[PDB]
Amino acid sequence: LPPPGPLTSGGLRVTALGGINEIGRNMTVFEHLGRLLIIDCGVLFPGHDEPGVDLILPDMRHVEDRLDDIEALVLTHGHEDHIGAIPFLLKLRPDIPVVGSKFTLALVAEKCREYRITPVFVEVREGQSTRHGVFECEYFAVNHSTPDALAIAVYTGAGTILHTGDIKFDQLPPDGRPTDLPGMSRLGDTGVDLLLCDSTNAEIPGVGPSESEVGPTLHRLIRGADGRVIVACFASNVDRVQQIIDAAVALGRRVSFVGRSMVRNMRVARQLGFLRVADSDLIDIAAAETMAPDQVVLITTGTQGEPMSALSRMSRGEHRSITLTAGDLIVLSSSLIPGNEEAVFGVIDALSKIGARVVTNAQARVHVSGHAYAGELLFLYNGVRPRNVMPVHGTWRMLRANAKLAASTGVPQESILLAENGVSVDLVAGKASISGAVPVGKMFVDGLIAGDVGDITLGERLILSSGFVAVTPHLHSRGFSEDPKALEPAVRKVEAELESLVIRIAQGVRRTVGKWVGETYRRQPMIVP
């Protein structure tokens, strides 16, 4: 598919630089009358195809040469796949206004300090409007698995856009602030031309359970526990922490946070008023072991089995302050992100060896998702009634599911646009269509440089998982064998090819050891001259 032409004056162009064919690094660029508005700037964490890499960024080459045009960066909420790449954007232009709610802006402040950046903040709350050049924005309360999420209406001259952010429709969130479906319904009456809609759970039928179903289950588990209780969850889910604390306090226990991410984030949550707990209900971690075990609940990180997490360390008998016993109850108040199963089940099995009881979502209602199920999205589609629909935040199977949901409410199929990263969507005179594609790749972060690591380097790293045998005589290897005498049978055969007189040395003994190995050992390490 070809690149798009110029954008008809007065129209609007929408393009994702990440987040559409995958879960992660969401970044969406809106173009209008030469100016730019960006909604979200997240990272993607690397998989097996990307060894040695730290982060994956949205493809910023597409704004690198027009950074002067960006009017603002607007942020739905504070999860890493929406804010993680902000330091790299601000390194390109440090004074881009950054718009968001108080809790969101607190997280990017802390993230941007790691890179020695001080953002220009414009702080925003639901119900408020702000102007950013040719763009105007209005913010709608969203309930999600993290406080202070916001959905965003963008008004230009081309019409009205609505971006949901990560959206869910819990009608009884513990914090009593459900998503503002009324307000978005009234905006639908106004006429919304384009709806950008979270697809994460679009293939799950029905309506998802309330986050408030978790509290009673945790209360039941703590009441029945004879010893200490340990609850692992995500530090960003303040309403989950609040329910753990409320259950523990209601049963005469005190609470302790374990792990830097948990300690830092609950500090922010307490300061901004999202977490309400009395100082006498908290114990410092280095003083929790002084009390009776049945008097403490520990709240930790490490739901994903990351080896340096607090719960991993505890499961191996290598936590400084805490030692686990068969009398402990461990609750994984979370779900298993795909690609982490081997690691999570390893921690569970180390805990089972010790004799501790482990409770996961598979056995009890200890976790709910933060994204709307298909039946909740239907409420959104009937409430907003968008003239056109673009699914975002999802892989193809999710984007397609969301497409059908919108179709089944009456959105014409020609008005349901599926635009992968790099595919533009033009909204012109009220009609919306796909207009062309540019290529987008994965920008890698590996330490202090970036951009010198690419397909060939990852290929070499993948090959090197069988070690390497290097010739340039002295034979050496590293990921190959523990037998020192294993190099010798190749030394004789190397000189033999060296009695040959007539870079061709490279392809000469590199081909000579390669035959010796794929014959003696039937291994295939990398051979380097």
Binding-site residues, please?
77, 79, 81-82, 144, 166, 367-371, 393
Nearer CB in complex with Zn ion: 22/166: 166
Q: Which amino acid is at 133?
A: G
- Of 166 and 239, the one with the shorter C-beta distance to Zn ion is 166
If the CB atoms of residues 82 and 319 are measured against Zn ion, the closer one turns out to be: 82
Residue listed under structure tokens 């030394």? 491
Does 246 help bind Zn ion (rule: CB under 5 A)? no
Residue carrying structure tokens 């690397």:
46
How many Å apart are CA 289 and CA 485, to the nearest integer? 53
Q: Which stretch binds Zn ion (CB under 5 A): 33-41, 46-54, 165-173, 429-437?
A: 165-173
Asked if 371 is part of the footprint of Zn ion (rule: CB under 5 A), the reply reads no
* C-beta of residue 243 within 8 angstroms of C-beta of residue 218: yes
Rounded to a whole number of angstroms, the CA Rg of the chain reads: 27
Task: Write the CB contacts of 271 (distance below 8 Å, at least 6 apart in sequence).
Answer: none
Positions 74 through 103 that interact with Zn ion (CB under 5 A): 79, 81
The count of chain residues that interact with Zn ion, using the rule CB under 5 A, is 3
Question: Would you say 81 or 180 has its CB closer to Zn ion?
Answer: 81
Locate 155 and state its tokens.
């008004």
528 neighbors 471 (Cβ within 8 angstroms):
yes
User: In the bound complex, what is the minimum distance in angstroms from residue 308's beta carbon to Zn ion?
Assistant: 23
DSSP letter for each residue of 327-364: T-EEEE-S---TT-HHHHHHHHHHHHHHT-EEE-TTTS
Question: Is residue 168 a contact residue for Zn ion (CB under 5 A)?
Answer: no
Site string for Zn ion, 40-79 (x = CB under 5 A): ---------------------------------------x
148 binds Zn ion (CB under 5 A): no
CB nearer Zn ion, residue 50 or residue 166: 166
C-beta of residue 523 within 8 angstroms of C-beta of residue 529: no
Give 229's strand partners. Answer: 297, 329
**Closer CB to Zn ion, 78 or 159, in the complex:** 78
35 touches Zn ion by CB under 5 A: no
CB of 209 to Zn ion, least distance (A): 18
Q: How far is the CB of 392 from Zn ion (least distance, A)?
A: 10
Give me the least distance between CB of 369 and Zn ion, in Å please.
10
Q: What whole-number distance in Å separates Cα of residue 402 and Cα of residue 432?
A: 18
Closest CA to 43 of 115, 145, 127: 115
Q: Residue 519: is it exposed, middle or buried by C-beta count within 10 angstroms (0-12/13-18/19+)?
A: exposed
- Annotated binding-site ranges for substrate: 367-371
The annotated binding site for Zn(2+) is made up of: 77, 79, 81-82, 144, 166, 393
> Taking a C-beta distance cutoff of 8 angstroms, is the pair 379, 352 a contact?
no
For residue 80, the minimal CB distance to Zn ion (Å) is 9
Name which of 289 and 420 has its Cβ closer to Zn ion.
420
- Minimum distance from CB of 141 to Zn ion (Å)? 15
Contact at 8 Å (CB) between 207 and 179?
A: no
C-beta atoms surrounding 290 within 10 Å? 9
Give min distance, CB of 150 to Zn ion, in A: 12
From 166, 170, 211, 246, residue interacting with Zn ion (rule: CB under 5 A) = 166
Q: Which is nearer to Zn ion, 79 or 163 (CB)?
A: 79
Amino acid in the structure at residue 184 = M
- Tell me how far, at minimum, the Cβ of 149 lies from Zn ion, in Å: 8
Residues that bind Zn ion (CB under 5 A): 79, 81, 166
